[PDB]
Amino acid sequence: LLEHRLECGANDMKVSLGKCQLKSLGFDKVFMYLSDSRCSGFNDRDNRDWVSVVTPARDGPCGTVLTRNETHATYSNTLYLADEIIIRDLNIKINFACSYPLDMKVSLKTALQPMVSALNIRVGGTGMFTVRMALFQTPSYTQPYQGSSVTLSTEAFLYVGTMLDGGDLSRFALLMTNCYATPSSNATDPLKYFIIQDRCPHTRDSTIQVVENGESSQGRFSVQMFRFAGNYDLVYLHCEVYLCDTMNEKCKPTCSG
Amino acid sequence: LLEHRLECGANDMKVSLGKCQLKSLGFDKVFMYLSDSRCSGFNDRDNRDWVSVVTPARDGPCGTVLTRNETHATYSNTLYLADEIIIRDLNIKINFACSYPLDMKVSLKTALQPMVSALNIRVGGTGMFTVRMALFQTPSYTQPYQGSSVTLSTEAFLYVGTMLDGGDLSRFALLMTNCYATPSSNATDPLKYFIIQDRCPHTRDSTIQVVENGESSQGRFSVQMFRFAGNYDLVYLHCEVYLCDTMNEKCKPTCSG
Amino acid sequence: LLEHRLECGANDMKVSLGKCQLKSLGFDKVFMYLSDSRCSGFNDRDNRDWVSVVTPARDGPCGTVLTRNETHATYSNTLYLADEIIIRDLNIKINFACSYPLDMKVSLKTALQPMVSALNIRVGGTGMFTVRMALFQTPSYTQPYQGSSVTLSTEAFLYVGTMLDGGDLSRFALLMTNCYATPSSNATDPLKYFIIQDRCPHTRDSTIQVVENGESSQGRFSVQMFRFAGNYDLVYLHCEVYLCDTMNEKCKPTCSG
Amino acid sequence: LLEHRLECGANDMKVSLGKCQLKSLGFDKVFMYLSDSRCSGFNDRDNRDWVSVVTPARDGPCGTVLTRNETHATYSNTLYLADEIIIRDLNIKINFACSYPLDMKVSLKTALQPMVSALNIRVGGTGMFTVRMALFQTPSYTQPYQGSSVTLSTEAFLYVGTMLDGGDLSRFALLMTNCYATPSSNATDPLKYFIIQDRCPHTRDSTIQVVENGESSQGRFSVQMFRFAGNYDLVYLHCEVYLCDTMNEKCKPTCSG
Ligand SMILES: *[C@@H]1O[C@H](CO)[C@@H](O[C@@H]2O[C@H](CO)[C@@H](O[C@@H]3O[C@H](CO[C@H]4O[C@H](CO[C@H]5O[C@H](CO)[C@@H](O)[C@H](O)[C@@H]5O)[C@@H](O)[C@H](O)[C@@H]4O)[C@@H](O)[C@H](O[C@H]4O[C@H](CO[C@H]5O[C@H](CO)[C@@H](O)[C@H](O)[C@@H]5O)[C@@H](O)[C@H](O)[C@@H]4O)[C@@H]3O)[C@H](O)[C@H]2NC(C)=O)[C@H](O)[C@H]1NC(C)=O
Ligand SMILES: *[C@@H]1O[C@H](CO)[C@@H](O[C@@H]2O[C@H](CO)[C@@H](O[C@@H]3O[C@H](CO[C@H]4O[C@H](CO[C@H]5O[C@H](CO)[C@@H](O)[C@H](O)[C@@H]5O)[C@@H](O)[C@H](O)[C@@H]4O)[C@@H](O)[C@H](O[C@H]4O[C@H](CO[C@H]5O[C@H](CO)[C@@H](O)[C@H](O)[C@@H]5O)[C@@H](O)[C@H](O)[C@@H]4O)[C@@H]3O)[C@H](O)[C@H]2NC(C)=O)[C@H](O)[C@H]1NC(C)=O
Ligand SMILES: *[C@@H]1O[C@H](CO)[C@@H](O[C@@H]2O[C@H](CO)[C@@H](O[C@@H]3O[C@H](CO[C@H]4O[C@H](CO[C@H]5O[C@H](CO)[C@@H](O)[C@H](O)[C@@H]5O)[C@@H](O)[C@H](O)[C@@H]4O)[C@@H](O)[C@H](O[C@H]4O[C@H](CO[C@H]5O[C@H](CO)[C@@H](O)[C@H](O)[C@@H]5O)[C@@H](O)[C@H](O)[C@@H]4O)[C@@H]3O)[C@H](O)[C@H]2NC(C)=O)[C@H](O)[C@H]1NC(C)=O
Ligand SMILES: *[C@@H]1O[C@H](CO)[C@@H](O[C@@H]2O[C@H](CO)[C@@H](O[C@@H]3O[C@H](CO[C@H]4O[C@H](CO[C@H]5O[C@H](CO)[C@@H](O)[C@H](O)[C@@H]5O)[C@@H](O)[C@H](O)[C@@H]4O)[C@@H](O)[C@H](O[C@H]4O[C@H](CO[C@H]5O[C@H](CO)[C@@H](O)[C@H](O)[C@@H]5O)[C@@H](O)[C@H](O)[C@@H]4O)[C@@H]3O)[C@H](O)[C@H]2NC(C)=O)[C@H](O)[C@H]1NC(C)=O
Ligand SMILES: *[C@@H]1O[C@H](CO)[C@@H](O[C@@H]2O[C@H](CO)[C@@H](O)[C@H](O)[C@H]2NC(C)=O)[C@H](O)[C@H]1NC(C)=O
Ligand SMILES: *[C@@H]1O[C@H](CO)[C@@H](O[C@@H]2O[C@H](CO)[C@@H](O)[C@H](O)[C@H]2NC(C)=O)[C@H](O)[C@H]1NC(C)=O
Ligand SMILES: *[C@@H]1O[C@H](CO)[C@@H](O[C@@H]2O[C@H](CO)[C@@H](O)[C@H](O)[C@H]2NC(C)=O)[C@H](O)[C@H]1NC(C)=O
Ligand SMILES: *[C@@H]1O[C@H](CO)[C@@H](O[C@@H]2O[C@H](CO)[C@@H](O)[C@H](O)[C@H]2NC(C)=O)[C@H](O)[C@H]1NC(C)=O
């Protein structure tokens, strides 16, 4: 028939009923007692007109009894409800209880910042990233060629490329900047024929075609095979590469005039 | 206080300290952390007992930072050194870094051998090497005589020689094999008096003496002058020479009996 | 397809091709190498625009090889022909060689003129040329008569002549200048009858006729026989002759008035 | 130093030296040349071992030169003397020449004997030789007596003789054979007194004496004068004479008993 506002703070229990009792149960005048009848109710106004009692959550200050469990401390008492000093039709009692946990967690809000003497040691060094080169037997760059020598007719079409195996593959593209054939295993020699001379292919010779350079970890290009004029019989391939920053630079070169 | 083993490969950085920390710093138990504290150290055994961490040379996989220059990519992180979960006397930190060049050079190891159609043209011919002869005015073979005729008494002593001027002087010695006087400018005539007849001088006549033949580019010999008996008045000198292989033959002849 | 100019001197070999290669083989630009590729060609102009190389005829200065025979020293090398640093359709090579004889003949050009003391001996003497005379039995002067005496009637016709047997027959004609009969074997005697008196016959007597005198080696004439008047019985014939220069004189006399 | 044998025939000149050159000039071996050096010497043996050359007496067959004069044809050449093919101490030359006359005399040796018709005329006659007689006035027969008559006393002594004047005085002596006195001029008369009767005087008469008869051209005798007895007065003398062959006869008579 009635609403029930129960609040429990750390120090005291409060219990109240509203102005619903102005009509409900016919309570023209309202009495409210706890088990110690010296503790009577009053009329609060902070939120609404409320009829209420207040009892400390202690053993016995208004007769309240404390039940003790492993998980909680429980306090209990009873409101007695009446419209008169004496009653004759219905003994109305509101039995109420509330509990508190005994297990809780806490923390300091101040952060502590320590300071300490310190020793600073430095060391340092260097290393390199593996790059390799390969010649292919097949159009689609697919197939390995291991042999320490390959013989070809001059009508044959080499396919070739370079690969970045080492690491940091998202940051560095493999960019060829210079690539050339020599008649010697020493890569420094006075006679060079150029396929890629300055970040661009030597497209003046129509038999050179480039597939991919600077966009990935594996560069690809192709050219018809040839023989050095003069008293020569072997062809060696040498090139120069550069690890190109994929974040702070355009790595794909423009080859034009 | 401590040694430092730093290795950098193409994929990962490794950093280690040895069992020197078994006594040094009192590290009964050893902790080792990088800037991402989820990456902790371990105990390696491939060479010695080493305490070490391993981090890929990438952006951030254990908090490692990459600094970028024009000449190098540099990676850096820090070891934290401790004997306990918590510390109180010295914050020990090892700051380390290593770098990699961005400019590198590469090569193919396979040699390429081309084949090609060929055209073969031959030509050929012949030539000769200049040899000359001279008469001298003086003992030491020194002096020229240009004149188109020389008059001498019969008490006079001619000095004469031949010279190889043409070329290939290290391979061919000038060897006289035959030399004779005629009463005529035609060198073929029926009357001959011999100075050198068959690779040797006609030493039967005591007035002939040879200096050098077959050892050099200039041969030398001498003989008292004479007149052809009969109705004759002029003397002409003619000889035959041979270019002698200094490598595959003894060129100095032996004149004996 | 091409001409070939090969010259070999005593010191160096020269080899060249002309401007035929301006169109031939499409050689827009011309490369020319020997087996040592450091020796390259050049553009000569002394006769025409020629493309050429020059190599000393030695062992190895541009890789040239020397083959040695008994008769010759032979040098050989190869031109490599190309229109580009590198080639792809035809390896064009010109193989060339030239040789030199090892056996040669030489001479001094100065003539030598000796002088010598001399001894001069003279001797000298004299001699004579045989001439003979004959009487003939027959008209055509043909027949010999040996007999130490011949008897004739006075109606008989002697035929007579003289002959030059001795020598120098082209230079000397036999010329009779005087001829006469005596009554004695002494040829000097006071009585003479003349047939030929002074380079001419005594034609006043009609019985004398001359055939040939001064034109040949055998003179001929005839006269009817006769007897000396008086106490005489024998006839002897005597004559005088002269050897006439056939080169510096007319030998045929003119007999007239 | 050397002898020189020079002979010249009608056809050829010969010139030689002997074995004196075996020691002289040291000519161990002997060379001998003329001006045409193709004509060399040889070793003759017909008389001795001689070294010699032979050249026809013509223009140029071994280079010999002919000089022509009015009196002679002269030929000249030179020997060259040597002990070797070539010489050095003395050029030895023998200059020689010989000549032939151009004027010569010749004869036929056959004698010619003519025969001829002949005419024979004879004539003939006779003559006489003058003899005379004389009377003398004086003892020595000396004096003439011309007178046509002489008177004498009878004591007188006539002297008388005869003379042969005519001729042939060497062949004929005048021989008186008969002589007598007559008393008459007719010499035939019957009375004769004889002085010489028969080749002898009538010496019985002591007054007759004969001087010379038959030995010469003049006979002589004498007798005392006398007169014929009887009638007579004149005395005449007559005699008979005979021409006596002085070659085939004794002409002096012997008068005896
Ligand atoms: C130690 O001691 C402590 C302190 O006593 C014990 O902790 C307490 O345990 C109690 C028992 O579980 C909790 O009580 C409540 O029990 C109700 C069940 O019984 C009542 O309801 C039945 C109705 O359900 C029945 O339906 C039919 C019949 O109708 C049956 O056939 C059927 O079988 C059902 O049982 C009645 O029949 C019965 O007679 C009882 O009257 C639960 O319903 C109740 O659940 C409530 O949970 C919360 C409580 O409010 C809090 O949360 C809300 C969240 O929105 C918040 O708004 C509030 O302000 C509160 O903070 C609400 O959702 C409802 O009110 C539910 O009804 C309870 O379970 C005590 O709550 C509990 N005390 C606590 C936790 O502080 C502890 O168990 C002991 N330890 C031991 C024994 O080891
Ligand atoms: C782009 O970015 C790249 C990457 O960072 C740059 O390349 C780096 O340049 C750095 C600067 O030159 C190099 O660092 C090292 O610098 C040292 C100098 O400073 C330190 O040392 C001083 C001591 O010397 C001083 O003495 C007194 C005081 O004591 C002073 O008064 C005096 O003036 C001196 O300065 C300290 O004072 C100072 O505070 C610093 O601590 C150099 O000594 C050092 O040289 C070392 O060189 C090699 C390195 O090891 C390699 O080679 C050996 C060969 O045997 C091999 O064994 C190893 O394994 C390595 O391969 C060793 O011989 C010694 O360790 C030397 O000490 C350096 O020069 C970086 O090394 C360099 N990084 C490279 C090259 O990868 C680049 O310059 C930038 N590009 C620009 C700016 O254009
Ligand atoms: C020691 O070593 C010396 C140096 O090598 C030797 O001397 C050399 O001997 C060589 C061999 O004889 C000479 O070579 C030349 O050989 C040619 C023959 O073979 C080539 O030709 C054949 C064609 O003839 C064939 O026809 C058919 C097929 O087509 C066959 O069925 C047939 O049987 C024929 O063989 C090819 O088949 C063959 O494969 C070869 O290619 C000769 O023809 C050549 O003669 C040339 O002679 C002169 C050379 O030029 C000089 O003279 C001219 C004169 O006008 C002048 O103008 C030049 O400037 C030169 O001065 C030319 O008239 C032509 O060019 C001829 O073709 C040769 O005979 C070498 O020449 C020779 N080297 C000399 C001499 O310096 C020597 O023999 C060795 N001693 C030994 C072994 O004892
Ligand atoms: C036409 O051409 C013909 C042919 O040439 C001419 O005939 C020739 O004339 C020549 C000149 O007369 C004759 O030559 C001989 O000349 C000698 C003289 O000169 C040489 O001798 C001198 C020595 O005498 C000198 O002494 C001192 C110095 O020492 C002086 O001071 C002095 O004044 C003297 O000159 C040298 O000085 C001089 O340099 C010359 O060397 C004559 O001596 C020589 O007489 C020789 O006569 C005969 C020759 O031999 C023949 O006869 C002998 C008889 O027994 C016989 O045995 C031989 O077999 C020969 O048949 C010998 O008795 C001696 O040998 C004498 O020395 C000559 O007179 C040529 O003989 C002569 N040729 C003939 C004749 O065939 C002709 O004259 C021309 N017609 C003209 C010009 O009209
Ligand atoms: C590569 O080849 C060269 C010769 O072609 C070798 O020699 C070097 O050549 C360069 C110029 O081409 C010179 O600057 C050096 O001084 C030379 N070095 C020597 C040691 O001579 C060179 O050594 C070769 N490289 C190798 C074999 O790795
Ligand atoms: C050299 O002289 C000779 C004559 O002495 C010249 O004639 C040749 O002689 C040889 C034998 O000596 C013969 O086999 C040849 O047939 C001759 N040739 C002629 C053309 O007659 C020879 O010509 C001279 N050489 C020269 C002038 O160079
Ligand atoms: C030739 O006959 C004459 C006589 O008729 C010989 O005598 C010579 O005669 C010439 C004159 O006729 C004189 O000048 C000489 O003096 C004479 N010589 C002598 C020696 O008397 C002459 O000898 C005869 N010739 C001969 C025989 O050969
Ligand atoms: C000489 O005298 C006589 C006479 O005495 C002459 O007469 C001759 O005499 C001889 C005899 O005596 C006779 O035989 C002759 O016959 C006589 N001749 C004549 C002619 O009578 C004689 O004639 C006288 N002579 C003279 C004169 O001369």
Residue numbers in the entry:
A (entry chain A), B (entry chain A), C (entry chain A), D (entry chain A): 328 to 584
Manuscript text:
The protease hepsin then cleaves the CTP and UMOD assembles to homopolymeric filaments with an average length of 2.5 µm in the urine.
The ZPN/ZPC asymmetric unit was then extended by rigid-body fitting within a lower resolution map (4.7 Å), refined in cisTEM, that contained more repeats. This fitting showed a helical architecture of the filament with a ~ 65 Å rise and ~180° twist, which is consistent with parameters obtained by sub-tomogram averaging. From here, we were able to ascertain an unexpected, extended conformation of the ZP monomers in the filament core, wherein a long, 28-residue linker (UMOD residues L429‒F456) between the ZPN and ZPC subdomains of each ZP monomer spanned the ZPC from the previous module (ZPC-1) and the ZPN from the subsequent module (ZPN+1). The elongated ZP linker establishes an intricate and extensively enchained scaffold for filament build-up from mature UMOD monomers. Reminiscent of donor strand complementation in subunit-subunit interactions of pili assembled via the chaperone-usher pathway or the more recently discovered type V pili, formation of the UMOD filament involves a β-sheet complementation mechanism extending across enchained ZP modules. IB is further stabilized by hydrophobic interactions between ZPC-1 (F555, F553) ZPN+1 (I413, I414) and the linker (P441, V443).
